[PDB]
Design a protein around this nucleic acid. Structure first.
Ligand SMILES: [Zn+2]
Lengths: 77, 360, 93, 78, 105, 95, 79, 93, 90
DNA sequence: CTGACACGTGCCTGGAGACTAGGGAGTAATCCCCTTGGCGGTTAAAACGCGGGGGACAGCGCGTACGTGCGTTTAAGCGGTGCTAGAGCTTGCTACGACCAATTGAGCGGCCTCGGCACCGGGATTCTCCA
DNA sequence: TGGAGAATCCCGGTGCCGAGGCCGCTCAATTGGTCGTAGCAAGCTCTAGCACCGCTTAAACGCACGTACGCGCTGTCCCCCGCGTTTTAACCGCCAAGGGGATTACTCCCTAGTCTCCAGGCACGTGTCAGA
C-alpha cells in the first residue's frame, strides 16, 4: 500500500510527457513494478556506498555515484 | 571339479535371489511411483540400475536385499576431512535459484542425519499409504543410515534403500590415477567411463570426532557394474559366439570363500566382501587378457587369486581400485592382528584341499 | 621479448575442477581476456571507492566493496566469502 | 515546463520502505531523495517515450502492458 | 625459506604478480597487504566458476577440451554470469539456440 | 516439395548450432580496406585485425536481427521489414 | 563497390542465425547501410589508436580497444 | 607571478588542472602541455554550451539561465545531444 | 572547490548580459567534472596502451578526437593546439 | 514581495619561481617476420528464373474499455516548535606500506612428441508431406 | 494414421598438427631491514535528520456516460520460398620480397622533488531587484 502512493494521475502525468495520447488500464500495475525495480538497483548501491564510508545517512553524492554506476549520469547534486 | 560345483551352487543362490526378487521388485515398482509426485525434496528420486540387478554381485544375506535411490543434486562440492579420500563431506557452490536442499544444511555442510530422517519419514508415509502391496518400515537404529523396510509375506523378507546423491560433474581428484584399465579395456573405455556421474553414499566414520554424521563416501558401483558385465578386451568375449572366459567365475568363488570364512568365524566381520572385488580389479590390470582366462586351468586361476590376496595381506597394502591412495585394510583402519589371522586362514584353506568347501 | 599471461594459473585452476580436461589455446585466450577484464573492473571500482572517501590506499575492504557492487546477486556473496577466507589464512601465517 | 510529477511524501515513504530491506535502520539526506525521485521520473518519462513507438509500430494509440515489456526487452533490462 | 605469498593464502593465482600489477597500474598511491590476497582469491573464484560450467558443457558434448563454443554456453546459460558478461562477445562462440514459439508450425 | 517456411526453420537450427563465420572473408576484407581508405591511405591490416572486425560485425548483425524478430512478432507478422529494423535500432541508442 | 560483396545469401544466413523466419526484399539494401555504419565507427577509432602509436599497421589491439570504446567487449583476440 | 592560464591565454585554471591530473592516479608522470590542452578543451565545451543556453533563454525572454535552458540547449544541438546523451538534469523537464 | 568562478568568467564574454542561477551553475560544475574525468581517463588508457609513463598533450589530443563527436572534435583540437602554441612560446 | 543572486574584504593555502638529479623518451642501426601480391585449378557459392501459396494489407462491424466532467473526500504542503543522532573536523601515535639489497625458485621461450578431433562413407534413423 | 523421399544422426577407420610435457635461464618475486606518514582512536562541535501538530486546499477518488478506438473476421493479391541450371570468383596451395614492427645503445632533456614567497579564491556578511 506504499507503492500505491504512485497514484494513477501521476503515471498519466508522466505518460503525457512521454508523448502518449491514450493509456491502457493495465499499465499502472506495470509502471509500478518497473519503478520499484529501478529503485531497488539504485538504493542497493547507495547503501553499499554509505556502509563503506561507515556513515549512517545516505548522502546525495552517494546516490549520484550509485546512478553513475548504472550508466545514468545525473547532474545537479 | 569343486569349483564348477560351487559355481552351480552360486546359480542356486541366483534362484534364491529370484525368490526374493519376486516380492522386492513388485514392492518397489509400485512404491517408487508415489515419490515423484509427492512434491517434496525427495521428489524425482529414481532407483539406479546398479548393484546385483538380480545377479550375485550384491553379496548380501540370502533373505536380505539392498537397493539404492539416486537423488540428483545441484553442484556438489566435495571436501575430504582429516582423511585420505575414504570419507568426504558435501557442500554447495553458487546456485542461481537457491538450493532445492537449502533446508537440510548444518551451516555449510549437508549432513546425512537430516536427509535420512526426512527420507525415512517420507518412506513411512508411503508404506502406510499403499494397501495393495503389504509393506512396512521396521524401527530405526543409530548405527546405519539404511532406512530398512521389512516386508511381510508368508515367509519374512526385508529390504533397505540407501540414499545416494548423484553428481554429473567431473570425478573427484582422488581418482585421477585410478581405474587403470588402459591395456585391458583401452583408454577409450576409460575416458568414456569417467564421464558418467558418481554417487555419494552417506557413511559415518565411527572413528573420528569432529564430524561423524556429516560425511559421505564416494560410490562408483555403476562403473563397477559396467566393468563386470562387458569385461574382456575382445568385444565379443562373453558377449556372443561362445568364448567363455572365466574371470568373473573366479571372483564369484573367491567372494564365496570370503563369505563362508566370515560366517564360520567371528573376527572377520571387519573385512567386508568389497575388498575381494578391489583385489580382483587390481589384478585384472596386472595381466590384460592372458591365455590363462580359459575354462581349463581354472584351478590355476584360483592359485593366482589366492597368491595375490595373500601378497596383499602380508605386505599391508591393497589400494582402493578407484582411489589409489586409500588402503582398504591397514593398521589404522584395521589393526594387524585380525588380518594376520585372515592370512593364516587363507594359507590353511589353500592347503588340505580347501575343507571350507565340503559343507559349502 | 617476454609476454606474461595467466595461462599457467588458469591451467592450474582447471586441473582442480575437471582433472583430465584441457583448453584449446584460443579458449585460453578467451580466459586470459576475461581475467584481465575482471581484474580491471574490480581494480577501477576499488580505485574509485578509495577516492570518494579521500583515502590513498586500496585495502581488502575496498576490494570487498567493489566485489559487492560489481558482481551480480549470489556471485557477490560467494566471491567475498573467499576473499576474506584468504586474508585470514594469510595473516595467521 | 520543468517540475516534478510524483508527489513528494508518498515517494519518500516508498524510498524508505525499499531501503529498509538493505540496512535495518537508516536515514537519508534531504537531497538524497530529491535526486532519487528526480532521476526515477526521467527514467519513466524515457520508458514511455520508447514504448509509445512500440504501439505506433503495432498500429495502435493505446500503450499496453505488452509494449512496455518490449522497450525493456530490447534495451537489455529484460 | 622463501615461501610464496600465494601459497600461504591457499591460492593458485599469483598474489605477487597481482600486487605488482596493482602498484604499476595507476589505481592508488598505496596498496595494502590484504588487497592482492583478496583480489587473487576473487579472480580465482570467478575463473573456476566459469571453467567448471564450461567444462561441463564440453563433457556433455563428448569432448576432452574446452573451445569458445563451450565458454559461450557456460556464460549464457547462467543467470549471474550472463549478467556479468552481457556486453561481451566470445569470438567463435556463436549464439544460444532460441526460436520463438509463434514461428513453429 | 517442402512447403514454404519449412526450409526456413530447417536452417535456423543449423546456423545457431554452429559458430562458423557467415560472411565471405575476402569480400569483407575488401570492404574493410575500402572503408579505411577514407581515414588513412596506404594502410595495412594484420590478418588478426580483420578476423576481429568480422567477428565483431557479425555479432552486431545477429543481435540486431534478434531484436527485429521481436519487433516483427509484435506487430502481428513474421516477415521482418526495414521499419522493423529502424524501430529496433531506435529503442536502442543507435539513432 | 565492395559493399555489394555483402550478398543476399550472407544476410539471409545471418538472419537465420538471429531467428528470423521470413525476410522482406528490402531488408538487404537496409542491412548493407547498417553494417557500413557500424564498421565506419569501429574503424575510425581503430585508426585513431594506430596513428597514435605511429604505425602503418592496424593491429588486433586497435580493433579491440576501439570496440571497448563502443561498449562492445571482444574476447579471444588479446587484451 | 604570471599564472599559467594567463600565459596560455585561457580562463580555466592551468595550475588546478595540473594538480588534479597529478593527484588523480592517471599516470606516473604528466607532461607540461596536458594541463594547457585539457584546460583549453574544457573551456571550449563550456563556452559552447553557454553560447547555446544564453540565446535559448533569450527566446523565452528570461534574462537568466536555469536548468531548463541548459536542458533545451543540450537536446537541440545535434553534437552536444550525442556527447551529453544518457544524462539526466535536475529540473530540466 | 568548484569551477563556479571560471564558468562565470566564460559566461561574462559568451553572454555578457545574461546571468546564471545557482542550480544551473551546479550543473555547470557537474558537467565540467564529467568532461575532465572522461578526457583524462581516456588519456590514461592511451598512455597505458603504448607502455608509456606520462600523459602528454599528444594524448589529450587523441582522447579528444576519440571522445568528442564530429565538428566538436575538429574545433576542440584547434582551440587546444593554439593554447599550447601560446604557452610554449612564452 | 522575498528570498535568490551580486558584490566586498581577510586571509591562508595552494600555485609560481627557481635548482638539481636521473631516468623516461627520442634517435640511429639491424634483424626477421609477416603483410602483400601473383598463378593456377577445382568447385563451392552467388546469381538467375519462375510457379505458387501462404502471408501483408485493406475493409468492416461490434463492443468494451478509455477520457472528460462533476461532487466529495483524502491527505500532501507549508509553517512552527524542539530535540537528539551523527556528520565533520581535530590531534596522537603508531604501525603498516614504500623502498633498497641481496638471493633464488617460478615462469617464459624453445623444443618436440602423439593423441584428440575433424573428416569421410555407408547404414540407420527420423522428419516432412501429399494424401 | 500410411508410407516415399530427404536431412540429419551416427560409428568404425584416417592422419595431422596442436596441446602438453620437458629443459635452461633470467628476471621478477622474496627475505630482511629502515623510515615516515596515512589512518585509527578518541573527543568534541553543532548541522541537519526525525517527530509531532494544525490548517488550508490542491489534488486523488468515485461515478456517469458516450464516443473513440482495439480486435476479430473476411478477401485478395503482391511477393517471398523452394528448387533447378548456370556463371564466377572465393578458397587453397605455393613462393618471393620488401615494408615495417621490434630490439639495442648512447644520450639529453624533461618531469619529480624541495623551499619559499605570496596573490588568487574561498567563506562570511550585506544589499539589492528578477521574477516564482
Ligand atoms: Zn576371461
Amino acid at each position: 500500500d506504499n507503492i500505491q502512493g504512485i497514484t494513477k494521475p501521476a503515471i498519466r502525468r508522466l505518460a503525457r510527457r512521454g508523448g502518449v495520447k491514450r493509456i491502457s488500464g493495465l499499465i499502472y500495475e506495470e509502471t509500478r513494478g518497473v519503478l520499484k525495480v529501478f529503485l531497488e538497483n539504485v538504493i542497493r548501491d547507495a547503501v553499499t556506498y554509505t556502509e563503506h564510508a561507515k556513515r549512517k545517512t545516505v548522502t546525495a553524492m552517494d546516490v549520484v555515484y550509485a546512478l553513475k554506476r548504472q550508466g545514468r549520469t545525473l547532474y545537479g547534486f | 571339479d569343486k569349483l564348477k560345483k560351487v559355481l552351480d551352487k552360486l546359480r542356486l543362490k541366483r534362484k534364491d535371489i529370484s525368490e526374493a526378487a519376486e516380492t522386492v521388485n513388485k514392492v518397489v515398482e509400485r512404491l517408487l511411483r508415489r515419490m515423484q509426485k509427492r512434491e517434496s525434496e525427495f521428489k524425482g528420486v529414481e532407483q539406479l540400475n546398479t548393484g546385483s540387478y538380480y545377479e550375485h554381485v550384491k553379496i548380501s544375506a540370502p533373505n536380505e536385499f539392498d537397493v539404492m535411490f539416486k537423488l540428483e543434486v545441484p553442484r556438489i562440492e566435495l571436501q575430504e576431512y582429516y582423511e585420505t579420500g575414504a570419507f568426504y563431506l558435501v557442500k554447495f557452490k553458487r546456485i542461481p535459484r537457491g538450493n532445492p536442499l537449502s533446508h537440510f544444511l548444518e551451516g555449510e555442510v549437508l549432513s546425512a542425519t537430516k536427509m535420512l530422517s526426512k527420507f525415512r519419514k517420507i518412506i513411512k508415509e508411503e508404506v502406510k499409504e499403499i494397501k495393495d502391496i503389504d509393506v512396512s518400515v521396521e524401527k530405526e537404529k543409530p548405527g546405519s543410515p539404511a532406512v530398512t523396510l521389512l516386508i511381510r509375506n508368508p515367509e519374512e523378507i526385508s529390504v533397505d534403500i540407501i540414499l545416494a546423491l548423484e553428481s554429473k560433474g567431473s570425478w573427484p581428484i582422488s581418482t585421477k590415477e585410478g581405474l587403470p584399465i588402459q591395456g585391458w579395456l583401452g583408454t577409450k573405455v576409460r575416458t568414456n567411463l569417467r564421464r558418467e556421474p558418481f554417487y555419494l553414499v552417506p557413511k559415518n566414520a565411527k572413528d573420528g570426532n569432529s564430524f561423524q554424521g556429516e560425511t559421505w563416501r564416494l560410490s562408483f558401483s555403476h562403473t563397477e557394474k559396467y566393468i563386470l558385465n562387458n569385461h574382456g578386451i575382445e568385444k565379443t568375449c562373453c558377449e556372443s559366439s561362445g568364448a567363455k572366459c572365466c574371470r568373473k567365475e573366479c571372483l564369484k568363488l573367491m567372494k564365496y570363500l570370503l563369505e563362508q570364512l566370515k560366517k564360520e568365524f567371528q573376527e572377520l566381520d571387519a573385512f567386508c566382501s568389497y575388498h575381494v572385488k578391489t583385489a580382483i580389479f587390481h589384478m585384472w590390470t596386472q595381466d590384460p587378457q592372458d591365455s590363462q582366462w580359459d575354462p581349463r586351468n581354472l584351478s590355476s586361476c584360483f592359485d593366482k587369486l589366492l597368491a595375490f590376496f595373500l601378497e596383499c595381506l602380508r605386505t599391508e597394502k591393497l589400494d582402493h581400485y578407484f582411489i589409489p591412495k586409500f588402503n582398504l585394510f591397514s593398521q589404522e583402519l584395521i589393526d594387524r592382528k585380525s588380518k594376520e589371522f585372515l592370512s593364516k586362514k587363507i594359507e590353511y584353506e589353500r592347503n588340505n584341499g580347501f575343507p571350507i568347501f565340503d559343507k559349502l | 621479448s617476454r609476454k606474461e599471461s595467466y595461462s599457467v594459473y588458469v591451467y592450474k585452476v582447471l586441473k582442480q575442477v575437471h582433472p583430465d580436461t584441457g583448453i584449446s589455446s584460443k579458449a585460453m585466450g578467451i580466459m586470459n581476456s576475461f581475467v584481465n577484464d575482471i581484474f580491471e573492473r574490480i581494480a577501477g571500482e576499488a580505485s574509485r571507492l578509495a577516492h570518494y572517501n579521500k583515502r590513498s590506499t586500496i585495502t581488502s575492504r575496498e576490494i570487498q566493496t567493489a566485489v559487492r557492487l560489481l558482481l551480480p546477486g549470489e556471485l557477490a556473496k560467494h566471491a567475498v566469502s573467499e576473499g576474506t577466507k584468504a586474508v585470514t589464512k594469510y595473516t595467521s601465517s | 515546463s520543468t517540475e516534478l510529477l510524483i508527489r513528494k511524501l508518498p515517494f519518500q515513504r516508498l524510498v524508505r520502505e525499499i531501503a529498509q530491506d538493505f540496512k535495518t535502520d537508516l536515514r537519508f539526506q534531504s537531497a538524497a531523495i530529491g535526486a532519487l525521485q528526480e532521476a526515477s521520473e526521467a527514467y519513466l518519462v524515457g520508458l514511455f517515450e520508447d514504448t509509445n513507438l512500440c504501439a505506433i509500430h503495432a498500429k495502435r494509440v493505446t500503450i499496453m502492458p505488452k509494449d512496455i515489456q518490449l522497450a525493456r526487452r530490447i534495451r537489455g533490462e529484460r | 625459506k622463501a615461501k610464496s605469498r600465494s601459497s600461504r593464502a591457499g591460492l593458485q593465482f599469483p598474489v605477487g604478480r597481482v600486487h605488482r600489477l596493482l602498484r604499476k597500474g595507476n589505481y592508488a598511491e598505496r596498496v595494502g597487504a590484504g588487497a592482492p590476497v583478496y583480489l587473487a582469491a576473487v579472480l580465482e573464484y570467478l575463473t573456476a566458476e566459469i571453467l567448471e560450467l564450461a567444462g561441463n558443457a564440453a563433457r556433455d558434448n563428448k569432448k576432452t577440451r574446452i573451445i569458445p563454443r563451450h565458454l559461450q554456453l557456460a556464460i549464457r546459460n547462467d543467470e549471474e554470469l550472463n549478467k556479468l558478461l552481457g556486453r561481451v562477445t566470445i569470438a567463435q562462440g556463436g549464439v544460444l539456440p532460441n526460436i520463438q514459439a509463434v514461428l513453429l508450425p
